[PDB]
Design a protein around this ligand. Sequence first.
Ligand SMILES: *C(=N)[C@H](C[C@@H]1CCNC1=O)NC(=O)[C@@H]1[C@@H]2[C@H](CN1C(=O)[C@@H](NC(=O)C(F)(F)F)C(C)(C)C)C2(C)C
Ligand SMILES: *C(=N)[C@H](C[C@@H]1CCNC1=O)NC(=O)[C@@H]1[C@@H]2[C@H](CN1C(=O)[C@@H](NC(=O)C(F)(F)F)C(C)(C)C)C2(C)C
Lengths: 305, 305
Amino acid sequence: SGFRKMAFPSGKVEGCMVQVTCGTTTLNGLWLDDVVYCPRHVICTSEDMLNPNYEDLLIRKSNHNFLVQAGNVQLRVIGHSMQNCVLKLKVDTANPKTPKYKFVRIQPGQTFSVLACYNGSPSGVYQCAMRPNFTIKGSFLNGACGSVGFNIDYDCVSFCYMHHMELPTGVHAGTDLEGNFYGPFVDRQTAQAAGTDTTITVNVLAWLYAAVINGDRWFLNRFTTTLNDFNLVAMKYNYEPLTQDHVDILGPLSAQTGIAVLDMCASLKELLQNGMNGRTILGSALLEDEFTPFDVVRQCSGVTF
Amino acid sequence: SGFRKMAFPSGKVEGCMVQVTCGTTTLNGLWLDDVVYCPRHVICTSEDMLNPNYEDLLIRKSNHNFLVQAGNVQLRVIGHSMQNCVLKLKVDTANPKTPKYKFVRIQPGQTFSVLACYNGSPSGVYQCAMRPNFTIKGSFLNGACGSVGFNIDYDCVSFCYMHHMELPTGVHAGTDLEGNFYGPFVDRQTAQAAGTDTTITVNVLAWLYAAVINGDRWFLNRFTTTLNDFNLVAMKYNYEPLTQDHVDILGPLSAQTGIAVLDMCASLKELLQNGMNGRTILGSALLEDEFTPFDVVRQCSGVTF
Ligand SMILES: *C(=N)[C@H](C[C@@H]1CCNC1=O)NC(=O)[C@@H]1[C@@H]2[C@H](CN1C(=O)[C@@H](NC(=O)C(F)(F)F)C(C)(C)C)C2(C)C
Ligand SMILES: *C(=N)[C@H](C[C@@H]1CCNC1=O)NC(=O)[C@@H]1[C@@H]2[C@H](CN1C(=O)[C@@H](NC(=O)C(F)(F)F)C(C)(C)C)C2(C)C
């Protein structure tokens, strides 16, 4: 029993973290095979960040202007290339700790673990969801850029996020490992706003199934609803519309508990309209939306890596 | 910015997990140097767990009755010993991945990371507090026993917990690495209850300082209080009494924010007496008590390992 926000074990990713310095700017890099990936703004001075021309700035940089350190050991840089918002530094040594890996661009609503680093050294690990507005609710300070987000499927690490910036609301933005931002964000120090932050309905439903499996079931009411009637309610509370694809992904949890997805929708509708009346669900006084159906199954079944 | 429940990077601990089987019972073991530590109930059948005489049961076991596996490789068991509620298996190979480590018995209110394992393989990592009633609010299924709790201080791993059981309220109980239970618990399948679950006042205060540092400061009121007047309020809400030692540990956060601890106590008093009126603090609709002052400083300063 019990249900906690759980991150993947970080060991495979810890062995890939390096420190990248260009001039006076230092941040984290990810060393896989003979390439180090890092945010391209490592080449900026604080002034350049206000309105950078990355192509012009990078032209003043040679391989010897990038200092890459793994622990106390220096890596020799033998090439450099800019791919979208990431810089790729070719080094003369393949990382001996390179895990089996792939680069994935995740969909909004999916979750991943973040290994927060400073100066190439891991500080901690936490779980994040890619929100529908393509921001994450992270915890990052100066020097955190280059910290990565990932998922594990037994022995394969799927890297999906690299940290680049913080928006005025305190939420975070970054790119996939090809350097393409999630969302409309640009790597420039100018006012940018994320857009309306909607709730991931299929994740709230998965978390209510997690609650039932854990014996927390006071909220189960005597009503049912339809997809269109539920969505009329959900859109009023800034919830994402629920589709048959979402009902299908909830299939294993609905089958395990015997509770039809539309019956759970009707319980969610009552919780939205009436609130929780001072009660809690899985130790929370709010409806939690950062657990995917996969996270609930995995945790309630003990999937290992 | 941002404040999340953050676990330590788990790599150093992942390299210590092994699988221990005795008869038909399998659980996790911790391999450090040439010793594997695991819960002594690995020697029980399901029936034995109802009222076990561990001394008599262990006498029917020889070294060859313990199967220890690290990945696909078998470790040779050359000795065994029971120390309190843990079994210590001497193996013929020192773990080549043994980190710098120590065994610590933590105090109630302190936090640690849990690397949840099944069959000697890591499943995930989460942060826990040792509650004042000596239980933890974890997430564990059958086969999780032997999963450990730890903290890291740069390169040294301090192991503080080994998982043994779940209580009727859904909370968890276990021992330090010397096999002594935290709390009054015994490793027997009989009705046991944890006792009143009080709130860790110094941790709630540290989390309110984390909120202020993050710009969430709607709750700061115009009052102050005394330690005795605050404690009269706190004891009514099942909060632990606050002492000058706690005020001293809060010193760095009070100095950073300029907010005196007794002023923060008066804001906490109003939150207890009035509730949050539907508002949130750091994304929570409840007062969070599983962040120590050290966790807040470390996260707000970027301490690395
Ligand atoms: C990389 N190490 C930091 C991480 C930031 C620092 C504070 N918390 C974080 O997540 N990245 C930056 O400092 C990036 C970097 C320039 C400016 N910047 C920002 O995150 C700024 N944000 C914005 O300008 C905004 F609002 F548009 F998103 C900052 C004001 C410092 C938070 C570049 C090149 C984007
Ligand atoms: C070890 N792998 C499991 C972990 C348990 C299983 C469910 N969630 C967990 O944390 N440990 C046990 O099964 C231990 C073990 C016998 C019984 N047991 C329990 O946790 C039981 N609890 C109690 O009897 C109680 F309430 F007193 F704490 C159980 C009913 C299975 C939850 C021994 C030797 C204590």
